[PDB]
Amino acid sequence: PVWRFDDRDVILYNIALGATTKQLKYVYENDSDFQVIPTFGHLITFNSGKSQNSFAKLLRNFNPMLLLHGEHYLKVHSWPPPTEGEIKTTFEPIATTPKGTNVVIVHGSKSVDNKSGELIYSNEATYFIRNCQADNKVYADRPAFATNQFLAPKRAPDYQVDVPVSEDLAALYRLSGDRNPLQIDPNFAKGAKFPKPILHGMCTYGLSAKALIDKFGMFNEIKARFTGIVFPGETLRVLAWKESDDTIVFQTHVVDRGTIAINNAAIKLVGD
Amino acid sequence: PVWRFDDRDVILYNIALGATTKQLKYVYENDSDFQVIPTFGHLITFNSGKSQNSFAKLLRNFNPMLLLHGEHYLKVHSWPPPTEGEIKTTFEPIATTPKGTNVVIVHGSKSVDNKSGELIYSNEATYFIRNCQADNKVYADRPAFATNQFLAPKRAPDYQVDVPVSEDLAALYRLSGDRNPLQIDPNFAKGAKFPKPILHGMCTYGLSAKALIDKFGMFNEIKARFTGIVFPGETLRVLAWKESDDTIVFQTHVVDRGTIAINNAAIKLVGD
Numbered sequence: 001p002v003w004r005f006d007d008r009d010v011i012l013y014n015i016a017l018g019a020t021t022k023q024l025k026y027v028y029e030n031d032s033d034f035q036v037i038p039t040f041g042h043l044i045t046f047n048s049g050k051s052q053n054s055f056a057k058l059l060r061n062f063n064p065m066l067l068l069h070g071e072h073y074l075k076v077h078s079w080p081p082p083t084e085g086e087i088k089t090t091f092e093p094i095a096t097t098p099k100g101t102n103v104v105i106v107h108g109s110k111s112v113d114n115k116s117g118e119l120i121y122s123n124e125a126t127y128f129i130r131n132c133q134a135d136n137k138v139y140a141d142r143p144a145f146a147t148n149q150f151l152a153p154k155r156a157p158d159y160q161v162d163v164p165v166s167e168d169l170a171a172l173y174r175l176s177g178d179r180n181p182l183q184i185d186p187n188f189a190k191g192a193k194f195p196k197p198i199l200h201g202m203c204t205y206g207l208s209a210k211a212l213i214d215k216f217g218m219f220n221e222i223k224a225r226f227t228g229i230v231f232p233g234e235t236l237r238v239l240a241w242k243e244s245d246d247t248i249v250f251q252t253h254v255v256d257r258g259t260i261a262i263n264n265a266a267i268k269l270v271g272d
Numbered sequence: 273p274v275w276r277f278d279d280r281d282v283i284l285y286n287i288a289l290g291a292t293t294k295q296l297k298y299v300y301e302n303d304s305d306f307q308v309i310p311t312f313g314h315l316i317t318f319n320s321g322k323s324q325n326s327f328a329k330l331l332r333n334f335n336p337m338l339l340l341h342g343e344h345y346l347k348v349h350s351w352p353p354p355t356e357g358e359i360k361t362t363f364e365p366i367a368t369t370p371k372g373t374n375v376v377i378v379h380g381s382k383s384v385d386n387k388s389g390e391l392i393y394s395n396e397a398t399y400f401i402r403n404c405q406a407d408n409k410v411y412a413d414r415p416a417f418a419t420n421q422f423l424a425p426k427r428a429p430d431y432q433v434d435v436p437v438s439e440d441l442a443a444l445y446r447l448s449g450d451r452n453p454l455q456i457d458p459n460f461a462k463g464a465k466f467p468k469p470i471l472h473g474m475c476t477y478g479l480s481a482k483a484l485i486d487k488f489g490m491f492n493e494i495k496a497r498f499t500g501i502v503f504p505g506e507t508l509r510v511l512a513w514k515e516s517d518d519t520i521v522f523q524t525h526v527v528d529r530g531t532i533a534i535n536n537a538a539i540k541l542v543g544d
C-alpha cells in the first residue's frame with residue numbers, strides 16, 4: 001500500500017487547483033519556496049492500491065456507481081507536507097450508519113513515511129452511498145475537529161472570492177488519482193442519476209483550499225461536508241469567516257444554481 | 273534508457289495540446305477509441321535517461337541555456353502508437369555544422385518496444401546552439417522527409433485555424449518530460465536574452481499537429497522547422513495546404529507579432 005510521488009504529481013495537482021505561473025512556488029520544482037497544497041495528502045485514498053477499498057467489507061448491496069463523497073477530514077502532522085517520497089497507508093473502519101435506504105460510512109487512515117516511519121497524514125473519508133445497507137456500528141474514535149459542524153456565524157463573511165471551474169477540469173484533476181468514471185463519462189454519470197458528469201468532491205475542496213491559502217495562508221487541518229453537487233464549467237463562491245487567530249470557517253457555493261456545495265467546513269492555520 | 277509510460281502520460285499530454293472533454297478519445301482511458309496524439313513519440317528525447325544528452329559530447333563551449341530547438345522529425349512505424357508500455361531508445365549523432373558563432377547539430381534516435389524489439393518511433397532532433405563550436409561533420413544518412421524543404425505553396429491556404437496558447441501552458445506541458453527552465457523560470461530565460469520565458473518548440477508543434485489532425489486526420493510522419501519563438505499567452509495561426517493524397521504542408525504563425533514560428537513543415541497522413 002505504498003504511494004510513490006514526486007514534483008510532477010505535486011505540480012499536476014497544484015495546477016488543477018488553479019495554481020498559475022504567477023505562483024512559481026506551486027508550479028516550478030526548482031523554486032526556492034516550492035511546495036504542495038496540503039489537501040494533496042488525501043490522495044492516499046486513490047494511490048494506496050487494493051487495501052483502500054477495505055471499507056466495502058462492511059457494505060451490503062454496494063454499487064460503486066451510487067457512491068458519493070459525503071465528507072472529508074485531513075490532518076497534516078509533519079510540516080511542510082513532502083513534495084517527493086514514499087508513503088505507506090494503513091486503513092481501518094470508523095463507523096457505519098444507515099440513513100434510510102442509504103448508508104454513511106466513515107473510513108479512517110494513517111499515512112506514514114515508508115522510509116522512516118514518520119506520521120505525515122491522517123485521513124477520514126465519509127461516503128454517502130445510495131441504495132446500500134450496513135450494520136449500525138461505531139468501530140473507532142475520531143478527533144473533535146473531524147466531527148465539528150463548524151456552523152457559519154450569522155453575519156457576512158470576512159472574506160469572499162469567486163473561483164471559475166473549467167468545463168475540462170475533471171479530466172485534468174482526475175489524473176491525480178481518482179479515475180472514477182462518474183466525473184468523466186456521461187453514460188456513467190447518467191446511471192447515477194445526474195444529467196452529465198459531475199466534479200470530484202475533492203476538487204471543489206482543493207479549489208476552496210487554494211483560495212483560502214491565498215488569503216489566510218497555509219493550514220495543517222481541514223474538514224468539510226459535501227452538501228451539493230458541482231458541475232465542470234460552473235463558478236464557485238468561497239465564503240470565509242475567521243473565527244479565531246487559528247480557525248477559518250467556510251462555505252463553498254455554486255453561483256450558477258445558487259446552492260451550497262461545501263458546508264460545515266473549516267481550516268486550521270499553521271502559525272508563525 | 274527505458275521510458276515507462278501509461279494512460280496518465282497520454283492524457284496529460286493530449287490535454288496540454290488542447291484536447292478537451294468534447295474529445296473523450298484523447299482524455300478518457302476507457303473510451304473505445306482511446307488514443308494518443310502521435311507527436312507523443314518525441315518524448316523519448318526527455319524520458320530516456322542520461323544517454324539522451326549524448327549529442328553534447330560533440331560540442332565545444334556548450335551552455336544548455338543557449339540551446340534552442342531548431343527542427344524536429346518524427347516517424348511512427350507502428351500504428352497506432354501505444355498508449356501504455358515500455359520503450360528503449362538509442363541515440364546517434366547525425367551531423368554537426370557550424371553557423372558563425374552558432375552550431376547546428378542533428379541527433380538521431382530509434383525507439384523500440386522494450387519487451388518485443390519492435391520499432392515504434394524514430395526521431396531526428398536538430399538543435400541550434402548559440403555561442404557554441406563544433407567540427408564540420410556528417411555522421412549519417414537521413415530520410416528525404418527529414419531534410420525536405422516543404423516550401424509553402426504560393427496559393428492561398430486550403431485551411432486555416434487559430435490556436436490560443438494559455439499563458440500558463442508551459443507549466444503543464446513540461447510535465448510531459450521537458451523540464452528545461454528556459455520555458456518556466458523568467459530569470460533563466462533572461463540569461464538566454466528572452467524578455468519572458470518562451471514556449472517549448474515541441475508544444476507549438478504538438479498544438480499545430482493537434483489542429484491538423486482535427487481537420488485532416490491522423491498522421492504517422494512529421495517534420496518542421498522552428499523559425500520563430502513563441503511566448504505563452506500568444507495566439508498561434510496554423511496554415512495548411514493539401515499537396516497530395518499523402519501529404520499536408522503547413523506553417524504556424526504568431527498572430528500577435530506577425531512572425532513565422534513554424535515553417536518548412538509537413539505531415540504524412542495515415543492511409544486507408
Ligand SMILES: CCCCCCC[C@@H](O)CC(=O)SCCNC(=O)CCNC(=O)[C@H](O)C(C)(C)COP(=O)(O)OP(=O)(O)OC[C@H]1O[C@@H](n2cnc3c(N)ncnc32)[C@H](O)[C@@H]1OP(=O)(O)O
Nearest residue numbers: 068069070071099104128178180200201202226227228229
Ligand atoms: C477508492 C475509494 C473511493 C472513494 C471516493 C469515491 C470517488 C469519488 O470520486 C466520488 C465523488 O467525488 S462524488 C461528488 C462529491 N459529493 C457530492 O457532490 C455530494 C453533494 N451532496 C449531495 O448530492 C447530498 O448532501 C447527498 C445526496 C449526499 C445527501 O443529500 P440528501 O439526499 O438530501 O440526504 P439528506 O435527506 O440531506 O440526509 C440524510 C441523512 O444523511 C446525513 N447526510 C446528508 N448529507 C451528508 C453528507 N454529505 N455526508 C454525510 N452525511 C450526510 C444527514 O445528517 C441525514 O442524517 P440524519 O437523518 O441522522 O440527520
Ligand SMILES: CCCCCCC[C@@H](O)CC(=O)SCCNC(=O)CCNC(=O)[C@H](O)C(C)(C)COP(=O)(O)OP(=O)(O)OC[C@H]1O[C@@H](n2cnc3c(N)ncnc32)[C@H](O)[C@@H]1OP(=O)(O)O
Nearest residue numbers: 317324325340341342343371400452472473498499500501
Ligand atoms: C536531451 C535534452 C535536449 C533538449 C533539446 C531541446 C530542449 C527544449 O527545451 C528547447 C526548446 O523548446 S527552445 C524553443 C523552440 N525554438 C524556437 O523557438 C526557435 C525559433 N527560431 C529562431 O528564434 C531562429 O530560427 C534561430 C534563433 C534558431 C535562428 O535564427 P537566426 O539567428 O536569425 O539565424 P539565421 O541568420 O536565420 O540563420 C543562420 C544559419 O543558421 C541556420 N538556421 C536558422 N534557423 C535554423 C533552424 N531553426 N534549424 C536549423 N538551422 C537553422 C540557417 O540555415 C543559416 O544557415 P545557412 O546560412 O548556412 O543556411
